[PDB]
């Protein structure tokens, strides 16, 4: 294995209707398990997975405060930024923050990271050593010194280094089933002819988990043709994903082509032919 515990926070200012929207979604690699939505009919931290249901009030209450406090600082933050940029309070802006920690295939801390973005762009990134910040703008520099004089990297590092890894562990456990279970790709090719002398071959991978997958169309030995149209992996809506690669072939030649499909839930790679 190799795992990650990561959160994504978003704050969007709402001019007319006061208080900015604050969303917060957490993940144990690829599986959302919690979320806070200050807009939701319940402004509280809720479980998004079922293995999370077996969690006591203490946790939910605590995490609810955390998200609430962040929402608060983020509201202060959005104000400050509106200032650094000399911006009207009548327009909307977005503050995003992503942070996560990763484990080694060997089960301990690997790397940790943290970043903020404003109006869609990088703003302040916590450095690799996890002891420093890189502003990306000059407003960001003010945020950068403010940050260092305050010692934020310090905190962030602790969390990132213990807390974060320690709980990832606990979550992997409570999600023993779901989380460590791989689902391979149902596979298949399809023919959709274009002209009198050529068709499209489409290699399909459906229902797989996790989402990392690799589809390749190669003809009789060598690799990658002139055109492999490859759609962004997508969600089926059930926990699994879908993906497909297409290539255009001259009729008759349809078996000169083979599609290879790679996926963790496959004891070994799979080859398809029309």
């Amino acid at each position: 294995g190799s795992h990650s515990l990561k959160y994504f926070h978003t704050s969007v200012s709402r001019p007319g209707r006061g208080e900015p929207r604050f969303i917060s979604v957490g993940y144990v690699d690829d599986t959302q398990f919690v979320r806070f939505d200050n807009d939701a009919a319940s402004p509280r931290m809720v479980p998004r997975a079922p293995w999370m249901e077996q969690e006591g009030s203490e946790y939910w209450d605590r995490e609810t405060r955390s998200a609430r406090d962040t929402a608060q600082i983020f509201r202060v933050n959005l104000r400050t930024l509106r200032g650094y940029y000399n911006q009207s309070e009548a327009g909307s802006h977005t503050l995003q923050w992503m942070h996560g920690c990763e484990l080694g295939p060997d089960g301990r801390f690997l790397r940790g990271y943290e970043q903020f973005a404003y109006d869609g762009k990088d703003y302040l990134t916590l450095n690799e050593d996890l002891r420093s910040w890189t502003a990306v703008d000059t407003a960001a520099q003010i945020s950068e010194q403010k940050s260092n004089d305050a010692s934020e990297a310090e905190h962030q590092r602790a969390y990132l280094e213990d807390t974060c890894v320690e709980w990832l562990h606990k979550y992997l456990e409570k999600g023993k089933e779901t989380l460590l279970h791989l689902e391979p790709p149902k596979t298949h090719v399809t023919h959709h002819p274009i002209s009198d002398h050529e068709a499209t071959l489409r290699c399909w991978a459906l229902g797989f988990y996790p989402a990392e997958i690799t589809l390749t169309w190669q003809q009789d030995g060598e690799g990658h043709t002139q055109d492999t149209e490859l759609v962004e992996t997508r969600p089926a809506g059930d926990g699994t994903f879908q993906k497909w690669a297409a290539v255009v072939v001259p009729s008759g030649e349809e078996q000169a082509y083979t599609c290879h499909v790679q996926h963790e839930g496959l004891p070994e790679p799979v080859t398809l032919r029309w």
Partner: peptide, 9 residues
Amino acid sequence: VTAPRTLLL
């Protein structure tokens, strides 16, 4: 758990 405290910018 999310991080206990966030950066003030």
